[PDB]
Design a protein around this ligand. Structure first.
Ligand SMILES: *[C@@H]1O[C@H](CO)[C@@H](O)[C@H](O)[C@H]1NC(C)=O
Length: 154
């Protein structure tokens, strides 16, 4: 009808299998392929270009996309997500007006405990992986305090 029906006429000059539609040359494209302006020739979709394709390094492929992970990260079953190889929980330390508030949600516990409470006004927080220590700074005290993750050796 509308189109020249070239799909039926001659594969309709469609890169992918032509799909003769009553209007004419419709053609098609497999997953991960997009029709061009002629809507007959298929292109390659760069899934890596799309944000959130995978948690880590991405490799565009024909109609699909390969992804990698960090040495400390494990690729999930879906192949589009990386998860930490180490089983240790994440200690989401958050400073407070006079204390340090840390959350351990391992095994959906939501362990919210105040690691340090004898503080004037703590602003910055950081940790050392090698020594397993926690560094934080107090504005009013004007000092940089250090302690272990067990809240000791302050
Ligand atoms: C805290 O952890 C460190 C590293 O394991 C250890 O050396 C230190 O003795 C611990 N302190 C307490 C009292 O938990």
């Amino acid at each position: 009808l509308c189109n020249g029906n070239s799909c039926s006429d001659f594969n309709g000059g469609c890169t992918h299998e032509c799909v003769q539609e009553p209007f004419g040359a419709k053609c098609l494209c497999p997953l991960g392929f997009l029709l061009a302006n002629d809507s007959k020739t298929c292109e390659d979709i760069d899934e890596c270009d799309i944000l959130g394709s995978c948690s880590q390094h991405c490799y565009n492929m024909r109609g699909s996309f390969r992804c990698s992970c960090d040495t400390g990260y494990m690729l999930e079953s879906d192949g589009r997500t990386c998860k930490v190889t180490a089983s240790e929980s994440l200690l989401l330390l958050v400073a407070s007006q006079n204390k340090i508030i840390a959350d351990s949600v391992t095994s959906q516990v939501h362990n919210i405990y105040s690691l340090v409470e004898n503080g004037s006004y703590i602003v910055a927080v950081d940790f050392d992986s090698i020594s397993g220590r926690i560094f934080w700074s107090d504005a009013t005290q004007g000092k940089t305090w250090s302690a272990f993750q067990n809240g000791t050796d302050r």
